[PDB]
């Protein structure tokens, strides 16, 4: 516990206990380099707060909101494991608010798409799912025994700690009932909703039509053509103002997120006007900080120890 508080003080976020227990698990597997204990076997790397666990942050300006923050990792998303650097495959805890625990572990390929795929509710589940999926992907049999042994250790540790190993747990299916919309990232929004349905309202445009709007705007051949084409974004932003004035904050939360998912620099400012404010209105100030810093410095290489 004595090495936990410095970790969580650095991130301004609380980390669940499975994170630290998995640290101890990997330490027992390989005391010399626990973070990379699965790197020789799986090609995966423990990073982020594990970097603090490894003491590798002691080489040093250190901005942890960007540490391994991939191009499409939403502020809700805290990268914890890296895989293929060609596709920027990675796994991370997903937190809806800075005061809550992660709801599950998601995976994304930042060079492939913006979709975050649920991968269990804890890192044991995430690594087991990746391991099992690769076991069939691997075109060999001799080089599998090591994976069987490490997987055996994974299963026994999860059983001893009382963790379910399902890809989708009970708590995730409960959150999904609280999930109000997928918002191009597929992970769902959690916003306050009172007994009069106050707190959220849907966008004036469908998701497919929103993606079409983004395509037609980003592909405009001149800035004058964009300004003429910009009319639907301006309209949607005015209605977003209307909604926030009536406490339906999540709408302004969602629209910016879609632009965050779209990825074009032409939308960096407008999202910076929508997403931070929405987080401020939602009292998620840390996410406003994260989105400000990321939009100002959204890079394709993000290991702060380089």
């Amino acid at each position: 516990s004595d090495l936990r508080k410095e970790v969580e003080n650095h991130y301004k976020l609380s980390l669940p206990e499975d994170f630290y227990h998995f640290w101890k698990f990997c330490e027992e597997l390989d005391p010399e380099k626990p973070s990379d204990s699965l790197s020789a076997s799986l090609g995966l790397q423990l990073v982020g707060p594990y970097d603090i666990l490894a003491g590798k942050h002691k080489t040093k300006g250190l901005n942890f909101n960007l540490h391994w923050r991939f191009y499409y990792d939403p502020p809700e998303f805290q990268t914890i494991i890296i895989g293929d650097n060609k596709t920027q495959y990675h796994m991370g805890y997903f937190r809806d608010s800075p005061d809550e625990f992660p709801v599950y572990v998601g995976i994304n390929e930042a060079k492939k798409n913006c979709i975050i795929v649920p991968n269990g509710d804890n890192v044991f589940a995430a690594v087991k799912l990746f391991l099992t999926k690769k076991l069939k992907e691997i075109t060999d049999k001799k080089k599998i025994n090591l994976l069987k042994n490490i997987d055996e250790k994974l299963t026994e540790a999860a059983r001893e700690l009382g963790y379910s190993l399902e890809q989708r747990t009970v708590k995730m299916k409960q959150r999904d009932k609280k999930v109000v919309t997928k918002t191009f990232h597929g992970a769902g929004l959690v916003v306050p909703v009172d007994k009069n349905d106050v707190g959220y309202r849907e966008l004036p445009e469908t998701d497919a039509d929103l993606k079409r709007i983004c395509k037609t705007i980003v592909e405009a051949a001149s800035d004058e053509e964009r300004l003429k084409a910009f009319a639907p974004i301006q309209e949607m932003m005015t209605f977003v103002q209307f909604a926030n004035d009536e406490c339906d904050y999540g709408m302004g939360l969602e629209l910016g997120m879609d632009l965050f998912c779209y990825g074009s620099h032409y939308f960096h400012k407008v999202a910076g006007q929508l997403l931070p404010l929405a987080y401020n209105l939602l009292k998620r100030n840390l996410f406003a900080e994260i989105i400000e810093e990321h939009l100002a410095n959204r890079s394709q290489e993000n290991i702060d120890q380089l």
Binding site: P192, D194, K195, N196, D197, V198, G199, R201, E202, L227, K228, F230, A231, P232, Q234, E235, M237, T238, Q241, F242, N244, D245, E246, C247, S264, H265, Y266, F267, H268, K269, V270, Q273, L277, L281
Partner: protein, 474 residues
């Protein structure tokens, strides 16, 4: 009124006219929808006789509303009798109503329903009012906005509507409100939704038309219908006029029947209004600024006698709306919502709505980067004693019991300590600050708003010409 021919009949748009006989104009649009079986289709019929040569034709065109469809042109070489027969027969087949007595129309289930359509210069005026009128009286811009109300936002694909058609739509929204009020999502609800989608043409692509299930969609539909009515009144008002005007806008100005006088930038009134505009820009509407370009004095006839001068608590409050519809307000003043309109769409009831924070009302202007000009109107409103509301309750109007207006208690708002005066009316200067109203049971309203019910309690006083200045976009 002026009877237009469908332009899509290129072979006859310039050589032919729609047929008329007194009341009876042989033009008709039918709509059908059944979400139970996912039908949503239209059918237009028009009898056209050529202008040059004596030859009659029936034009029919049908498809999904919004998506242009299959058409047929049947020529008759002047066989007006046969053609009229065919017209009436098809009208009956598709409606189960006879055409000639179209007045007594009765829709039947599983058949198309009807709808109703609209088918020596000394220009002496101040230059500033001239620019204002030309801005608001620009017919081109009204046409362009109407076309955008069909091909940009598919709210009225096929065309426009009549006042009475809108009233029938409101009747259907009332039936929907009654249905939904009991939370029953069975068959009657689906039929009521069918009636709604029949009366007001929507385009759902292919996805089954969804059930209207919550209050938010009710209120959105209500606002759509309101925008339809607004466009109708705007085109009615912009009717051009002859008789030696030498500046037709001067007759349009008479149609405003509202004195609008230019104010000097250095006058106390102009500076104070600018102070009020700037000091009350909410901080959470920071995607743009606003500059006061010009300010006009308002003198609307008949309002003076109506004002509730006896009532205390008189303040100047904002009211925003799109650049185009202002022509209606200046001619007729602000109106309470349509009575036939469902009450449950307005979380705190009907009436006239005002803010004291410029940016909150200003959000209702929908100004743009390309089109950077918007208007905000200031009105003196005698609120009298306000009824205090913490949480949404659409039934606020019954709770008045002697009060004259409702206040919705927002988290952020100016405090009376900073209030100033203008011509004996209270001017509620900002900045916004915390008001110590909170809710240990539910949500908290973001910002106050004030609503009045008697139309006689509003007196428009100045019209503000405002440049909305947007900023960097990426």
């Amino acid at each position: 009124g002026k009877a237009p021919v469908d332009p899509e009949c290129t072979a006859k748009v310039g050589k032919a006219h729609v047929y008329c006989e007194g009341n009876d104009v042989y033009d008709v649009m039918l709509n059908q929808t059944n979400l139970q079986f996912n039908n949503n289709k239209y059918y237009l019929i028009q009898l056209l006789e050529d202008d040059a040569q004596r030859n009659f034709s029936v034009w029919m065109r049908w498809g999904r509303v919004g998506k242009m469809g299959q058409h047929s042109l049947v020529a008759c070489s002047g066989n007006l009798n046969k053609a009229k027969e065919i017209f009436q027969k098809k009208f009956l087949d598709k409606t189960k109503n006879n055409w000639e007595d179209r007045e007594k129309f009765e829709k039947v289930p599983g058949k198309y329903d009807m709808l109703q359509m609209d088918y020596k210069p000394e220009s002496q005026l101040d230059l500033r009012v001239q620019e204002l009128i030309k801005l608001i009286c620009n017919v081109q811009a009204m046409e362009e906005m109407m076309m955008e109300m069909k091909y940009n936002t598919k709210k009225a694909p096929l065309g426009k509507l009549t006042v009475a058609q809108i009233k029938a739509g409101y009747q259907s929204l009332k039936k929907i409100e009654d249905c939904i009020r009991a939370g029953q999502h069975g068959r009657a609800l689906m039929e009521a939704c069918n009636e709604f989608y029949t009366r007001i043409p929507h385009d759902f692509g292919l996805r089954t038309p969804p059930l209207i299930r919550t209050q938010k969609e009710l209120s959105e539909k209500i606002q759509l219908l309101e925008a339809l009515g607004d466009i109708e009144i705007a085109i009615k008002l912009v009717k051009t006029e002859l008789q030696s005007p030498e500046h037709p806008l001067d007759q349009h100005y008479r149609n405003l029947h509202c004195a609008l006088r230019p104010l000097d930038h250095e006058s106390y009134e102009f500076k104070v209004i600018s102070q009020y505009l700037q000091s009350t820009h909410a901080p959470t509407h920071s995607d743009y600024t606003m500059t006061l370009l010009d300010l006009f004095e308002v003198e609307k006839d008949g309002e003076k006698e109506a004002f509730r001068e006896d009532l205390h608590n008189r303040m100047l409050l904002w009211h925003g709306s799109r650049m185009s519809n202002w022509v209606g307000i200046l001619s007729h003043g602000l109106r309470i919502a349509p009575p036939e309109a469902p009450i449950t769409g307005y979380m705190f009831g009907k009436g006239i709505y005002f803010a004291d924070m410029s940016s909150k009302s200003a959000n209702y202007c929908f100004a743009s980067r390309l089109k950077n000009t918007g208007l905000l109107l200031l009105s003196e409103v005698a609120l009298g004693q306000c009824n205090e509301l913490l949480e949404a309750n659409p039934k606020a109007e019954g709770l008045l019991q002697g009060k004259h207006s409702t206040k919705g208690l927002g988290k952020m708002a100016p405090s009376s300590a900073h209030f100033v005066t203008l011509n004996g009316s209270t001017v509620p200067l900002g900045p916004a600050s915390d008001t110590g109203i909170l809710n240990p049971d539910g949500y908290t309203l973001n910002y106050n708003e004030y609503i009045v019910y008697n139309p006689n309690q509003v007196r428009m006083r100045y019209l503000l010409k405002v440049q909305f200045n947007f900023l960097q976009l990426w």
